[PDB]
Design a protein around this ligand. Structure first.
Ligand SMILES: CC(C)(C)c1cc(C(=O)N2CCS(=O)(=O)CC2)c(NC(=O)Nc2cccc3ccccc23)s1
Ligand SMILES: CCCCCCCCO[C@@H]1O[C@H](CO)[C@@H](O)[C@H](O)[C@H]1O
Length: 332
């Protein structure tokens, strides 16, 4: 067991191993940058807030640990370390998770460099490659957006989740359809790609309904084939009253863009989620001919997420979170 040390960081206690110095807040879980003396690298440390306060907090805490322990891919956040000050299960009340510090998010990059077409290819390709891996574990991100995409000085990207969001959300999420296929994430990627291409937010909705109004103006009112799949009588009736709207020609909208990028966008920003390109399909799209390697887009090991259907006691979730902390093996 390492030896710990306590720190005050803006009204929060932080109790971390001595391995980790120069803690400097970044995020509020809350997150600090720190320097890892055992590798010499900069890290981000997340302290979970109140991990075990309710059954739902308890289950969420276990959820994040299991997910992060499973994610082993270049374009997805991975765990360098996980620790607790606790010497025993009875002591156990905080969880800390450790990852390689990436020093910027894609929001930062977007607001002060106009990306070239090659940049857009490389960045969207890596998002799709991480997303191929995430989706192959039967996980849905559900909140993909620039601020959830960490980028380094070589333009290498990792997908993560800090926990407006609405600007990149699939319109089925905002109408609470409740099924959601993985292509909700592909909607998000199309909003991100549009913005890397134009430098402008594609759908800067003011609020919830404005969001949906902006979406329908680009992609048009649901077509016959879509309206036909809507089982809720009420959802339906409303929509044919909703102005009606031509789907816009995207080639017109993204004027000077690579026509392969335009084509990819048309295949991601489809209203009907059954008709949106998948991440593995998008990787094979000709826009990414310079980056695609079919032997280097790996998928995840099976991920047991049967815990998701379970309704357990606080102490049960807590004990399970404790087992995962103990069983953790750091990467090489
Ligand atoms: C889907 C995907 C992309 C693999 C992730 C899910 C969660 C997750 O379970 N929750 C649970 C639900 S929730 O908190 O709303 C969203 C997050 C991650 N957590 C995560 O990225 N944590 C971290 C974020 C930022 C800095 C970190 C630094 C060190 C370690 C982890 C960090 S990443
Ligand atoms: C206000 C704009 C209307 C939004 C229409 C979005 C329809 C989403 O797409 C739907 O997603 C479901 C998965 O959740 C699938 O079961 C449906 O078959 C698919 O058509």
């Amino acid at each position: 067991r390492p030896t710990f040390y306590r720190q005050e960081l803006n009204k929060t206690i932080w109790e971390v191993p001595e391995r980790y110095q120069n803690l400097s807040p970044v995020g509020s879980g809350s997150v600090c940058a720190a320097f890892d003396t055992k590798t010499g690298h900069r890290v981000a440390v997340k302290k979970l807030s109140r991990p075990f306060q309710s059954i739902i907090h308890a289950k969420r805490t276990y959820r994040e640990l299991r997910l992060l322990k499973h994610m082993k891919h270049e374009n997805v956040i991975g765990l360098l370390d996980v620790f607790t000050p606790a010497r025993s299960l009875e002591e156990f009340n905080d969880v800390y998770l450790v990852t390689h510090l990436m020093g910027a998010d894609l929001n930062n990059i977007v607001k002060c460099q106009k990306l070239t077409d090659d940049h857009v290819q490389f960045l969207i390709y890596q998002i799709l490659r991480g997303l191929k891996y995430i989706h192959s574990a039967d996980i849905i991100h559900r909140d993909l957006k620039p601020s959830n995409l960490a980028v380094n000085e070589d333009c290498e990207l990792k997908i993560l989740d800090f926990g407006a969001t609405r600007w990149y959300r699939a319109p089925e999420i905002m109408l609470n359809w409740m099924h959601y296929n993985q292509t909700v994430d592909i909607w998000s990627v199309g909003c991100i790609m549009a913005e890397l291409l134009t430098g402008r937010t594609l759908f800067p909705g003011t609020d919830h309904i404005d969001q949906l109004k902006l979406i329908l103006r680009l992609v048009g009112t649901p077509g016959a084939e879509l309206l036909k799949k809507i089982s809720s009588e009420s959802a339906r009736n409303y929509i044919q009253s909703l102005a009606q709207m031509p789907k816009m020609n995207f080639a017109n909208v993204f004027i000077g863009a690579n026509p392969l990028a335009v084509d990819l966008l048309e295949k991601m920003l489809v209203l009907d989620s059954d008709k949106r390109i998948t991440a593995a399909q998008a990787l094979a799209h000709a826009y990414f001919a310079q980056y695609h390697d079919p032997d280097d887009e790996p998928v995840a090991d099976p991920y047991d997420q049967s815990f998701e259907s379970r309704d357990l006691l606080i102490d049960e979730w807590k004990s399970l979170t404790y087992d995962e902390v103990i069983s953790f093996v750091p990467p090489p």
